[PDB]
Amino acid sequence: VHFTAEEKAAVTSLWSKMNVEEAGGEALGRLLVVYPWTQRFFDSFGNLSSPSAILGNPKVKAHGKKVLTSFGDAIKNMDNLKPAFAKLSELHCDKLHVDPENFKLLGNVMVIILATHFGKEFTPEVQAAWQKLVSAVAIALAHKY
Amino acid sequence: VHFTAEEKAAVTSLWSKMNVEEAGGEALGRLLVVYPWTQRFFDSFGNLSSPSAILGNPKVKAHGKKVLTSFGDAIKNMDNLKPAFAKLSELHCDKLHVDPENFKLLGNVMVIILATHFGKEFTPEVQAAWQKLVSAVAIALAHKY
Amino acid sequence: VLSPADKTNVKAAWGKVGAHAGEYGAEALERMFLSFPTTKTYFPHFDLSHGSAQVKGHGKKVADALTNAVAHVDDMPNALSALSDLHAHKLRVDPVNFKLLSHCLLVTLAAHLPAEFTPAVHASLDKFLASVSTVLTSKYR
Amino acid sequence: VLSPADKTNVKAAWGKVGAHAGEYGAEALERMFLSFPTTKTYFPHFDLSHGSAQVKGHGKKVADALTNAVAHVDDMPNALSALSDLHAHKLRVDPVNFKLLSHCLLVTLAAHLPAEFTPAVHASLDKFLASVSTVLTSKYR
Numbered sequence: 001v002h003f004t005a006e007e008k009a010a011v012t013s014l015w016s017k018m019n020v021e022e023a024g025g026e027a028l029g030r031l032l033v034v035y036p037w038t039q040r041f042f043d044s045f046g047n048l049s050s051p052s053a054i055l056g057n058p059k060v061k062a063h064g065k066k067v068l069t070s071f072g073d074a075i076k077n078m079d080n081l082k083p084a085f086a087k088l089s090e091l092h093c094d095k096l097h098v099d100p101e102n103f104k105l106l107g108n109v110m111v112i113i114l115a116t117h118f119g120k121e122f123t124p125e126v127q128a129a130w131q132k133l134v135s136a137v138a139i140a141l142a143h144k145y
Numbered sequence: 146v147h148f149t150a151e152e153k154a155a156v157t158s159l160w161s162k163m164n165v166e167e168a169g170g171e172a173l174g175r176l177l178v179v180y181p182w183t184q185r186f187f188d189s190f191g192n193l194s195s196p197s198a199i200l201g202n203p204k205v206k207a208h209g210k211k212v213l214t215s216f217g218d219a220i221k222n223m224d225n226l227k228p229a230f231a232k233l234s235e236l237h238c239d240k241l242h243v244d245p246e247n248f249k250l251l252g253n254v255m256v257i258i259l260a261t262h263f264g265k266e267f268t269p270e271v272q273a274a275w276q277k278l279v280s281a282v283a284i285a286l287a288h289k290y
Numbered sequence: 291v292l293s294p295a296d297k298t299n300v301k302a303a304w305g306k307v308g309a310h311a312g313e314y315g316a317e318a319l320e321r322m323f324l325s326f327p328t329t330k331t332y333f334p335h336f337d338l339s340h341g342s343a344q345v346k347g348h349g350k351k352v353a354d355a356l357t358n359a360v361a362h363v364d365d366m367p368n369a370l371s372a373l374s375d376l377h378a379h380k381l382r383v384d385p386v387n388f389k390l391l392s393h394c395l396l397v398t399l400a401a402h403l404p405a406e407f408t409p410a411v412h413a414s415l416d417k418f419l420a421s422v423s424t425v426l427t428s429k430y431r
Numbered sequence: 432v433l434s435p436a437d438k439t440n441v442k443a444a445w446g447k448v449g450a451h452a453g454e455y456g457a458e459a460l461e462r463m464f465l466s467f468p469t470t471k472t473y474f475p476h477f478d479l480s481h482g483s484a485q486v487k488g489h490g491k492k493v494a495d496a497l498t499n500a501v502a503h504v505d506d507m508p509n510a511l512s513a514l515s516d517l518h519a520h521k522l523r524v525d526p527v528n529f530k531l532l533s534h535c536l537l538v539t540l541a542a543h544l545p546a547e548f549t550p551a552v553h554a555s556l557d558k559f560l561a562s563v564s565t566v567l568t569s570k571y572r
């Protein structure tokens with residue numbers, strides 16, 4: 001997928017103003033709450049019995065930072081993405097056995113997080129850019145599958 | 146995706162014994178009957194009001210032979226599939242606007258047609274081979290998307 | 291299927307939307323057309339430009355239909371039988387499109403009510419919208 | 432949602448299956464494990480070899496559950512509440528797997544009853560299996 005100059009702008013503009021700390025666990029928490037079957041992969045994290053327990057879980061917030069980070073590496077490699085996520089594509093495929101369908105879900109939840117943080121600033125034009133990015137990352141991880 | 150020698154055998158063995166004539170419209174007919182929203186793309190074909198009208202429709206059977214044919218081209222190019230379906234990938238993407246999700250559906254319906262024709266002969270081992278082929282063709286057409 | 295908790299969240303959340311239901315419906319559509327342009331092929335008769343009167347008007351129609359589904363959350367098949375005929379029978383809308391509209395609707399609610407859009411509410415609405423979509427894509431008459 | 436026609440097809444078709452319901456359930460699973468190996472990770476405690484006694488035994492359990500759903504096609508949520516707890520709450524099965532099992536089940540029926548598996552029946556069963564899957568993947572208690 002190819003990105004226009006206006007699209008690279010919208011993505012990089014927001015990445016600059018966001019809480020990389022707290023926003024990671026926010027996304028992972030929502031994934032586990034809205035799409036319950038995903039808790040099967042994070043069974044080892046401990047207490048995932050309630051929305052409060054999940055969001056309060058220390059290991060969810062920690063892993064959240066890691067996920068958010070790998071998204072920043074994507075913005076840095078917009079022209080050539082596939083080569084950057086080959087390490088994670090193998091990890092999630094052969095090592096974890098996660099269906100690619102779930103990568104799209106995390107991407108959507110990602111877009112919803114940005115909407116709650118930026119409100120009116122997260123315009124339809126800005127959203128279109130992020131959807132395009134999210135779709136590219138999802139299909140980069142599905143190389144093995 | 147890579148194919149084993151036993152897998153290339155199972156696929157080519159059945160392609161040899163099948164009714165390329167009547168089996169094309171059989172598949173297209175089932176697609177339109179089981180997944181109704183697909184009739185939107187073949188609106189120009191005429192009467193698609195009932196299972197009898199759809200299966201009896203002359204252009205459904207005609208177009209069916211064409212689809213079955215493009216599947217035969219896949220068996221001959223099991224090594225490098227992506228390059229063979231680039232003409233159709235563009236046609237279905239930018240020209241027709243068909244969601245890739247529908248390619249998987251036609252593939253499944255394809256496997257079900259072979260099951261009705263070969264009965265007992267269509268063993269679990271044979272099915273596994275065909276599922277693999279069907280999945281590859283579906284993702285070959287999704288190059289644009 | 292919706293749990294009693296889902297029904298409570300959906301009712302409580304839709305109440306907070308209130309008067310702006312029409313303004314939100316218009317925006318969800320504007321976002322969908324922008325983020326997923328292929329959905330534009332379903333509205334050839336529409337002037338899909340920036341602040342179209344048709345789009346803002348259809349947003350109200352879509353919003354009222356949803357307000358109606360919340361009231362009849364226990365009898366959706368019977369209450370939406372008319373819309374099911376339109377989308378499934380006449381128009382023949384591909385179900386994948388419902389997922390796209392549901393997403394843009396959630397995104398819109400998240401931007402205007404970030405405080406109210408808790409993970410718990412998000413989860414219940416997602417399920418609710420999924421139920422509505424199932425009804426509008428099925429031929430049951 | 433199922434139309435009255437779907438309910439008739441499902442009842443008529445499942446009747447023709449009859450006694451072999453258990454033999455068909457066993458085969459659908461054998462095909463699924465073969466065609467989609469990732470589904471094997473849900474049965475670590477199972478000996479998944481060729482003619483396993485566990486697999487053939489689980490096929491009967493799965494088949495009986497479906498026979499039960501056909502009888503209670505009008506009250507699936509209440510009749511399958513136990514299985515919904517198992518698959519959705521306890522095991523946490525990814526919904527995509529239900530589509531894979533439903534497919535292999537249809538394929539099995541097509542091979543043993545090609546005469547009876549008309550496009551119309553196929554369509555009704557696909558919908559029916561989709562309803563069952565929705566119930567087993569939802570947390571509604």
Ligand code: HEM
Nearest residue numbers: 038041042066067070071088096098102103106107137141
């Ligand atoms: C946007 C797509 C995704 C990205 C960018 C991503 C990123 C990552 C990263 C950076 C790690 C940590 C690897 C390491 O420390 O070496 C990881 C591991 C992991 N991911 Fe993802 N992930 C994605 C989607 C998913 C989804 C959807 C699931 C399952 C619902 C999942 C489940 C896991 C699990 C179980 C681990 C291992 C955790 C551990 O080591 O304790 N990932 N992922």
Ligand code: HEM
Nearest residue numbers: 183186187211212215216233241243247248251252282286
């Ligand atoms: C296994 C994936 C598919 C294959 C191999 C395939 C193959 C073909 C072929 C060979 C043609 C005729 C092109 C020509 O004559 O130049 C075609 C055109 C077409 N296909 Fe497909 N197709 C596939 C899936 C679909 C699906 C799922 C849909 C929509 C549900 C669809 C809709 C159409 C339409 C509307 C046309 C144009 C018909 C016309 O020219 O009158 N195709 N396809």
Ligand code: HEM
Nearest residue numbers: 329332333351352355356377381383387388391422423426
């Ligand atoms: C949450 C799911 C949806 C709801 C509640 C909904 C609601 C409605 C309503 C209330 C109307 C106008 C009915 C009337 O006044 O007769 C309508 C018409 C229509 N809908 Fe939807 N809809 C939904 C999803 C979709 C989707 C996903 C599509 C395709 C992208 C679509 C396409 C159309 C079209 C083409 C019309 C006809 C427009 C016209 O009035 O000329 N709808 N829908």
Ligand code: HEM
Nearest residue numbers: 470473474492493496497518522524528529532563564567
């Ligand atoms: C048509 C949908 C399905 C039906 C009717 C069904 C039916 C059943 C039944 C009746 C049992 C045994 C219940 C008992 O005796 O307590 C069961 C258990 C189980 N099911 Fe399913 N199931 C379905 C789909 C799936 C799918 C798609 C998966 C994952 C690939 C799955 C995984 C399991 C597992 C792991 C067990 C526990 C096995 C054991 O007894 O040790 N099921 N299911």
